[PDB]
Amino acid sequence: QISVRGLAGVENVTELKKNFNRHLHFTLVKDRNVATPRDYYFALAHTVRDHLVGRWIRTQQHYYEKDPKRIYYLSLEFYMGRTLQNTMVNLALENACDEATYQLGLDMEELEEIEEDAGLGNGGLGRLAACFLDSMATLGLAAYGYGIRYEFGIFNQKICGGWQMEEADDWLRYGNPWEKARPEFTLPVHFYGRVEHTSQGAKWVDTQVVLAMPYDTPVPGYRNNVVNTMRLWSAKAPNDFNLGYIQAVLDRNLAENISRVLYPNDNFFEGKELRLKQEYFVVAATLQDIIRRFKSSTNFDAFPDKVAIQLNDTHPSLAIPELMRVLVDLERLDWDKAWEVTVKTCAYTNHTVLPEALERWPVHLLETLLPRHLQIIYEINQRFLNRVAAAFPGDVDRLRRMSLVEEGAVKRINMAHLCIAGSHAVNGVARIHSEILKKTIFKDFYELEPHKFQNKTNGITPRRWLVLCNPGLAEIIAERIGEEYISDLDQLRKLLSYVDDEAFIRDVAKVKQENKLKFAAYLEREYKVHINPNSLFDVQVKRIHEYKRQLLNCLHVITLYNRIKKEPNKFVVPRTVMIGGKAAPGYHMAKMIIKLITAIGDVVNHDPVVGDRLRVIFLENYRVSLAEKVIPAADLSEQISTAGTEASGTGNMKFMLNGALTIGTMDGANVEMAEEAGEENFFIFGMRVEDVDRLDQRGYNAQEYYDRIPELRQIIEQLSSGFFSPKQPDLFKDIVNMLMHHDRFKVFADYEEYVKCQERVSALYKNPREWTRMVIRNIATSGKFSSDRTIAQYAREIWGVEPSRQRLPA
Amino acid sequence: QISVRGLAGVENVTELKKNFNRHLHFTLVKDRNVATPRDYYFALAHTVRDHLVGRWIRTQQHYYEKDPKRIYYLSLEFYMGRTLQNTMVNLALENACDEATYQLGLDMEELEEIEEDAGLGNGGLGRLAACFLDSMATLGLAAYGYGIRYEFGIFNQKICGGWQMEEADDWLRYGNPWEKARPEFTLPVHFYGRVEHTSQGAKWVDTQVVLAMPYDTPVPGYRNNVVNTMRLWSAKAPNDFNLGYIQAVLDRNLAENISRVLYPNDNFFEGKELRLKQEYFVVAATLQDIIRRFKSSTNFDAFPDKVAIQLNDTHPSLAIPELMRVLVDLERLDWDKAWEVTVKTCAYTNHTVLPEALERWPVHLLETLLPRHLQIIYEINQRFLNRVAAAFPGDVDRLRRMSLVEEGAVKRINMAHLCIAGSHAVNGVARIHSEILKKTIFKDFYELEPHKFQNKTNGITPRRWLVLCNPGLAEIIAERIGEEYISDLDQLRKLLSYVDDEAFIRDVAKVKQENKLKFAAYLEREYKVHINPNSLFDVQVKRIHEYKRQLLNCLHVITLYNRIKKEPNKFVVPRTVMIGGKAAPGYHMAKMIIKLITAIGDVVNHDPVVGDRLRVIFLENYRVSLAEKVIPAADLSEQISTAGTEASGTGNMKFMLNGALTIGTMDGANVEMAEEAGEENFFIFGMRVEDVDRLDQRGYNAQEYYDRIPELRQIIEQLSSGFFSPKQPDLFKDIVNMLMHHDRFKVFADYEEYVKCQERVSALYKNPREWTRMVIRNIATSGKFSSDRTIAQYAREIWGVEPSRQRLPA
């Protein structure tokens, strides 16, 4: 149907059809008379999968022949989403499969909806890893993603009476056609035990063994015939485990629980033993695999020339002492040489400055679980502090500030300090974030080793986040500038010469309207909710946290409702306000905010005076597949975190690429986004980082704003008195109390400027032509935010490898 | 190479080769340069599997069209063994695959050794179910095997210092190519809860739900294009199970433990809750599946015309009250009609008279786990006893003897009594066993309902147990009488006219010698043990239990050793004595017997005076795959249980078919075997059932035999004093004590006649021509013991269906 989706040739369509029928018969053991849509999905998935394996085998053979430097990306999360459409896109198979399935009497889009998300992540961090894998393959890097194959990914969110309910994400129930189990490459992982010292070095003995079984998933590059590997470990008990008999077999679960479930806390730090086990499990198995592959190319001098290890946050920080353990205890390298190799091999990406996310493990846990690793950490610390002492003689407080060991009630290990010490490069994820790191939390380390500190502004893959989810926009763009931009997103700048083009303006607005209509229909078909598709689609989708200030959005929504109730017969730009995102199950306040949003909906959506001028919808079960639906339909992107808190954001970039305007604070990547588009083309409001600092030094008093802003006072009075909860008048007392007395994120401080800025949004929306022209200026300058750019920078500035757009032979 | 293995045509060989290469590339994601033998096995398995599915789909379509009466065989065990060779044999693909793999530069027999046994059974009962499935498909019956897909089958047995060690049988580690998961037909199973009574009947409420997920495995008939289904249930927790969050997900294991592990006790009764859960789980899911299939053909009058349920032992006895529950509580049939349907549908096979195997469940377990079922059982009992009371007025002790409820310290339910009450047919598994049932343990029930009681003598499939494991013998037989006997084993009678044929005699003895050489080589290659292949292969392989009297064999072995030590320079027929079998992990005496066997080996195998005249080997990890190796190599089959204890035996039949002579008591099927061959062609010895009874009435005094048999006295003195355990002199005190004071199985009573009979064996073995002629007379009369005969009798006399040898279209 459309150009960007590839050719639908006669030979290819005929071949896909017969392979589809073959899989339905031989693979699924079905015939057309008993087959359900699910069976048809699987037949197609298997057909498309076959096209990957040829390329998969020769890519890995190619890496064996050419022996390039290998990139190992270690993450506890890979938020992959659905694989079918992505695979078709990257292999140029989408139109052919569309045709083949059409001729079989099937709708492909219907089949695509059957696939479960691979939900092996929480949000931003996990999705970044997934975008990164796509870009590394597209740029021809010999890269491997290493993680854990969780049996249960992020929970499915149900809303019951306005309250979040969790249910297990049993994503493997029907099987996963994309993975290949590799039980032959199973590796042992050691836990507990004790350390023995001998004539010739230390020995870790009396350990409990858990087996790590790998599952490989292919990662296709964009139309370059490169197929990389994501290897995920599954925990398996050894066959002599605990070997009454029956109980010993049943107790195998204790070992296998390691890979059972993803911690759903968006990596808020919870010092749980099971989480530490997960962290070591991925690290220990991965490093054995890395060394094995290296030896099959004694002299570890060349190790850093052939291996790069990227630590995604501090979660795999145990790679540093585990690499030391292997080189010193097993390979018998001396400490100094082993350390040199370790530092040159490892690099660390920091993802946030917020203290609640910082991993600080109690020493007593490491003592019991990983006794050899604790000894190595102590030695690293000692030698690191000796360097600090020599560089800044007599500076005793620097010594305690920089120590990897934190003293106090319970001694802890600061994993971020470990990572900086043991890595040759440390990067933040947006310019403002990387600057804050050097100025605040890692200032001491920057003073000692300034060369280590870098920035790598985050990005998103234009394959999934434009071509896949918004084919209509990808197509109208391709018509004017060709298809090259899909792997060279800087080419969207060429769209600036179409900002005064009346045909293009009409087409952009047309694509948006079609997306909005399609999403409005989806909401009715699957959730029975009615929305006006002519209203401004105002959307905030992201994990529920206080720093993201969903509550600030709530205050604006209520302001609009109160203003309508005051002057009902006055014209207001109609809005559909959509908010979605999961709360961590044990995060009481986050769950209360969800309830508040639904409670506002209950009042606003049923007021006859309001009509269809204002609607408030909580988007249930926000996840990658839903993101691909809601983002192309958005008009306004809410990016309103307190300045200095959102390290980067990536959702912001997704909205920019897809034709939404942004209302946001000068935080994270919002700053670079506004810089690229021009500030006149963004709706910036609120305190900057410097203003936040000034307020903290003076002392934040929320009562001041309440006293001086009558519209704000009314809302708080409404919340307190039970306007939004008639049967439970006191329901929101905790929210009000937090807002009034202990708000870390200064919601009231930005309220006035936010409401004012929102008025400016509504004014522009009244002028469709000028709205769309500003949209075009956003889309046209979104090029910097491709993960191809991000990964090219990692490659050249950290990993020391050259990206390549050159095809491998088909 | 050989005739019985089918054709190796040019088109078929070329097609197998390309499909082999296709699976290696697309399915295994490998190429020849990285592939291991395991990969080659899987490529072949997938290639052969493809040939099944076409036939599998049309068989099940055929059953849907013709709507025949369906046979449901319910068992907690199916001891399937390996599937690859069996599939090739039944599809006539063996020579073609042999050729195809040879041309690819691969040895097929090597690939066949890679397959794990499907070890979902303990021994005789599980293997019977597996032979039965093969025969039902071969005889064209619309039959379904229903069981549990255990994650862990029977443990692997390791011998360490003469002691049995157990390790988990992780049979699914590398995947199972034969099964097809059917998550779409997942069914809910209910546990716990309570019973509510309403205006319109009882309701079972507040239950915990466990999901039953089916896996289907194909069962090919012999060369008839019939492919039946074995459906095995896997336990799955529902997604809202227990829904802190992490713990709720981890606690899913509690529900899923139901299908985790096979109880390895050879069905010695252990009243464990988990076992009861397993029993209900298979029953509840199976019956829902049966009713579903029946409704997709209101009027349950025709239910018994379209459905037969065979209860394999009492393990699935809960089918009776579960069927009543469904018909009464859910379908709202009246009791009397529901009961009529239940009785006409169900039939029960008893497998033993030994009390330790009898299932008698504590009422308090059923009260908590299955409260509605207990109420139904009580009602069945009440109505049953009213019938007893009317038939035998005033016979109060009959009432208590026949009750399904046993009173005492703890009240129990007698599951065997439930089965007789609720079934239209009850059968034993050999003529002597079925007679004992009517005369002893079920005498009261036989008096009430004589028509219910039947015999169905067990059998074995001649496909697995001749053609597959002994191709050399199958071939020399086919040369004389053709191939028809493979599905018509009565034709072996034609071999009687070759008993004086010098060429045939030479060939039979040649096949045996080749088998013995092959097995002697196997023992060295895989276990580094040296045996003389010119010795008499004296073998006893079967589960270790006191009733099977492995100890009687041990006493003979020691007698031979003592006789050699007394007269070293006197000629004795050389023997290799092989004993193998697993002991239940908690069965102390069985484990001590294993240790004794190895301890005897330690003394006998290293005595220079003995030389290679006597060897004692314990065969490690006895299982189906090992049976297929050792049975064709055997000269003497030990079947020496105390008369009246071994209900049938099936190992005995396997040895008879494969050219071994039998030394045995008049027990189980041994009686019918001797009757078929003629007693002159069997080595029968020892007490008959009647002699055992006489001894019990008089009182068994083991001391009498010790006092009067000096050779026996010497052995006991040797055991007691530490001759076979120098470093632990008292090691065998428990064995001696049991033999002397509490031997339920009268080992000493049969000692003299056994030793004497063994002398007669050795005498015949000295005359190779006369040994072989007697062998020919055994093989020639083994026809009755085909499971095709057994199943034809079940079909006609219990299930009311006609077997068919007619082909389905290919």
Ligand SMILES: OC[C@H]1CN(CCCc2ccccc2)C[C@@H](O)[C@@H]1O
């Ligand atoms: O780098 C990927 C994302 C990583 N996240 C990490 C969020 C960590 C966090 C989690 C809970 C509470 C506070 C902080 C921040 C975003 O700005 C980034 O875009």
Ligand SMILES: OC[C@H]1CN(CCCc2ccccc2)C[C@@H](O)[C@@H]1O
């Ligand atoms: O019917 C299959 C077999 C069933 N077995 C059941 C053995 C049951 C048992 C298990 C432990 C202790 C005593 C008895 C007896 C054999 O004679 C039969 O051949």
